[PDB]
Scaffold this active site. Structure first.
Site, PDB file in Angstrom:
ATOM      1  N   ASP A 104       0.858  -1.216   0.000  1.00  0.00           N
ATOM      2  CA  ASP A 104       0.000   0.000   0.000  1.00  0.00           C
ATOM      3  C   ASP A 104       0.884   1.254   0.000  1.00  0.00           C
ATOM      4  O   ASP A 104       1.847   1.364  -0.768  1.00  0.00           O
ATOM      5  CB  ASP A 104      -1.007  -0.101   1.169  1.00  0.00           C
ATOM      6  CG  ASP A 104      -2.045   1.023   1.140  1.00  0.00           C
ATOM      7  OD1 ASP A 104      -2.914   0.998   0.207  1.00  0.00           O
ATOM      8  OD2 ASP A 104      -1.947   1.964   1.991  1.00  0.00           O
ATOM      9  N   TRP A 105       0.592   2.280   0.845  1.00  0.00           N
ATOM     10  CA  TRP A 105       1.418   3.476   0.777  1.00  0.00           C
ATOM     11  C   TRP A 105       2.845   3.206   1.217  1.00  0.00           C
ATOM     12  O   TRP A 105       3.750   3.945   0.810  1.00  0.00           O
ATOM     13  CB  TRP A 105       0.822   4.604   1.635  1.00  0.00           C
ATOM     14  CG  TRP A 105      -0.331   5.198   0.860  1.00  0.00           C
ATOM     15  CD1 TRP A 105      -1.698   4.981   1.042  1.00  0.00           C
ATOM     16  CD2 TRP A 105      -0.214   6.052  -0.277  1.00  0.00           C
ATOM     17  NE1 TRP A 105      -2.412   5.662   0.073  1.00  0.00           N
ATOM     18  CE2 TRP A 105      -1.525   6.337  -0.735  1.00  0.00           C
ATOM     19  CE3 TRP A 105       0.866   6.619  -0.944  1.00  0.00           C
ATOM     20  CZ2 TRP A 105      -1.764   7.174  -1.826  1.00  0.00           C
ATOM     21  CZ3 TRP A 105       0.646   7.421  -2.010  1.00  0.00           C
ATOM     22  CH2 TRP A 105      -0.678   7.723  -2.452  1.00  0.00           C
ATOM     23  N   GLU A 128      -0.131  -5.888  -3.080  1.00  0.00           N
ATOM     24  CA  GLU A 128      -1.202  -4.903  -3.014  1.00  0.00           C
ATOM     25  C   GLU A 128      -0.628  -3.485  -2.898  1.00  0.00           C
ATOM     26  O   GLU A 128      -0.873  -2.745  -1.937  1.00  0.00           O
ATOM     27  CB  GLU A 128      -2.154  -5.245  -1.864  1.00  0.00           C
ATOM     28  CG  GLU A 128      -3.199  -6.279  -2.331  1.00  0.00           C
ATOM     29  CD  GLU A 128      -4.192  -5.691  -3.298  1.00  0.00           C
ATOM     30  OE1 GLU A 128      -4.463  -6.371  -4.348  1.00  0.00           O
ATOM     31  OE2 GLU A 128      -4.713  -4.573  -3.039  1.00  0.00           O
TER      32      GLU A 128
END
Ligand SMILES: [Cl-]
Length: 293
Positions: A104-105, A128
């Site tokens: 993610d981030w 992801e």
């Protein structure tokens, strides 16, 4: 049964006037494995993965600024704030070479740091992760209205800041198996008060969707171009149906990225670590030895 405990002693480092918390286990030397969470999680997300890797390698898992047990300075919590603080954390820990494990981030942070430090990165395991999303049609339909609302003036702040949607809605929505109350309470602890929730709202407002915001779009395109040309060893974990990385994208990456191993984890949406931590951790551990020539 998937563990709910967090059996890691706290470590803190002062950077830029703030304390950041991190997990630090495993041997004290060798190439460290740096685990980077994203929204709205913390090093808690890696709790069942790290123990697979710690017998062989140092494992460092910071809480991003304003998240987990790290301090809460008065920032906008824009992407560049997280870049600055993670750069300062890596510096304060003295890291030279690293293996990245990113989500993610945390993957936008990790891939951006790798692009800037290509000779320091000895491997990247990712899942992801943040890539340019060409239009809203490539965002999963079942989460489209919500993320469009997060990015709508006033509405998004009401949802995320006032009503804590990222913790109470998105987190369970994006795990296939049911989260327990104990796990939810770990995730809730950094955000019990609404004045602590700015990072949670700024992150979906930074997602690179249809060119916007333009600065993040450019930065993410840049590190994806770097990744496609880099010989660095790569390890991708993907699930079905996925969220940011659906199966068609996992297949595109299997064809396009150099030196890539892929691992299918079974059912998974976005927080793959909560659906199959043991396969993620065991496969990272099995992949690491070849990075040491
Ligand atoms: Cl987000």
């Amino acid at each position: 049964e998937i563990g709910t405990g967090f059996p890691f002693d706290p470590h803190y480092v002062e950077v830029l006037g703030s304390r950041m918390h991190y997990v630090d286990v495993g041997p004290r030397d060798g190439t460290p494995v740096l685990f980077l969470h994203g929204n709205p999680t913390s090093s808690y997300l890696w709790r069942n993965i790290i123990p697979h890797v710690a017998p062989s390698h140092r494992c460092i898992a910071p809480d991003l600024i304003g998240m987990g047990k790290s301090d809460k300075p008065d920032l906008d919590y824009r992407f560049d704030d997280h870049v600055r603080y993670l750069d300062a954390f890596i510096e304060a820990l003295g890291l030279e070479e690293v293996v990245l494990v990113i989500h993610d981030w945390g993957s936008a942070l990790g891939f951006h740091w790798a692009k800037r430090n290509p000779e320091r990165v000895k491997g990247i395991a990712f899942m992801e992760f943040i890539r340019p999303i060409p239009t809203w049609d490539e965002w999963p339909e079942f989460a489209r209205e919500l993320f469009q609302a997060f990015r709508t003036p006033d509405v998004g702040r009401e949802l995320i800041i006032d009503y804590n949607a990222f913790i109470e809605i998105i987190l369970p929505k994006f795990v296939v198996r049911p989260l327990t109350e104990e796990e939810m309470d770990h995730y809730r602890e950094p955000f019990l008060k609404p004045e602590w929730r700015e990072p949670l709202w700024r992150f979906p407002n930074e997602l690179p969707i249809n060119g916007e915001p333009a600065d993040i779009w450019a930065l993410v395109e840049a590190y994806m171009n770097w990744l496609h040309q880099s010989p660095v060893p790569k390890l991708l974990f993907w699930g079905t149906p996925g969220v940011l990385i659906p199966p068609a994208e996992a297949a595109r990456l299997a064809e396009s990225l150099p030196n890539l191993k892929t691992v299918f984890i079974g059912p998974g949406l976005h927080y793959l670590q909560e659906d199959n931590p043991d396969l993620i951790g065991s496969e990272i551990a099995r992949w690491l030895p070849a990075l040491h020539h």
